[PDB]
């Protein structure tokens, strides 16, 4: 097998910024990886295309994936509303880590975050499932529009997304 590679084309207030590609660890967290992959292609009839990163905190992370409420209160998995924490094998070791947002144990939906720093305090509480493969510079650029409380200064959207591998 080969781990799937997905991409997001990011736009800032409608201006294309660049492409970020992620490697999804299907070999370690197959269910979580599959959920993110399907949501990136939109094959189930819903997904990330057109959604925004609603909360960005410099030196911490960029959060997005709420394609229903667009405010951090929505989103859903391809398995129904929410699914279990698959495993906590991987850790939040440094910049580029892709991890699942939640509202407590076993509440994974569609929201995720990209770490821009090692965030060890989230280990064992959030399921790590992939990492930035290319375009980490785009993630850094995105960080500039964030703020301490998370509010973004420009609308950061996923203009297009899909699978590459």
């Amino acid at each position: 097998m080969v781990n799937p590679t997905v991409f997001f084309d990011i736009a800032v207030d409608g201006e294309p910024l660049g492409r970020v590609s992620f490697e999804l660890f299907a070999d370690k967290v197959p269910k979580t990886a599959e959920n993110f992959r399907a949501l990136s292609t939109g094959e189930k009839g819903f997904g990330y295309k057109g959604s925004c990163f609603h909360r960005i905190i410099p030196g911490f992370m960029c959060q997005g994936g709420d394609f229903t409420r667009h405010n951090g209160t929505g989103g859903k998995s391809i398995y129904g509303e929410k699914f279990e924490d698959e495993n906590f094998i991987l850790k939040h070791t440094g910049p580029g880590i892709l991890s699942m947002a939640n509202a407590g144990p076993n509440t994974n939906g569609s929201q995720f975050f990209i770490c821009t720093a090692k965030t060890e305090w989230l280990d064992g509480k959030h399921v790590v499932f992939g990492k930035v493969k290319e375009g980490m510079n785009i993630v850094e650029a995105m960080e500039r529009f964030g703020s301490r409380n998370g509010k973004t200064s420009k609308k950061i959207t996923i203009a297009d997304c899909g699978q590459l591998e």
Partner: peptide
């Protein structure tokens, strides 16, 4: 604080 929740963001 620095959490990544969905609905009730905490300190």
């Amino acid at each position: 604080x620095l959490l990544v929740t969905t609905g009730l963001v905490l300190a």
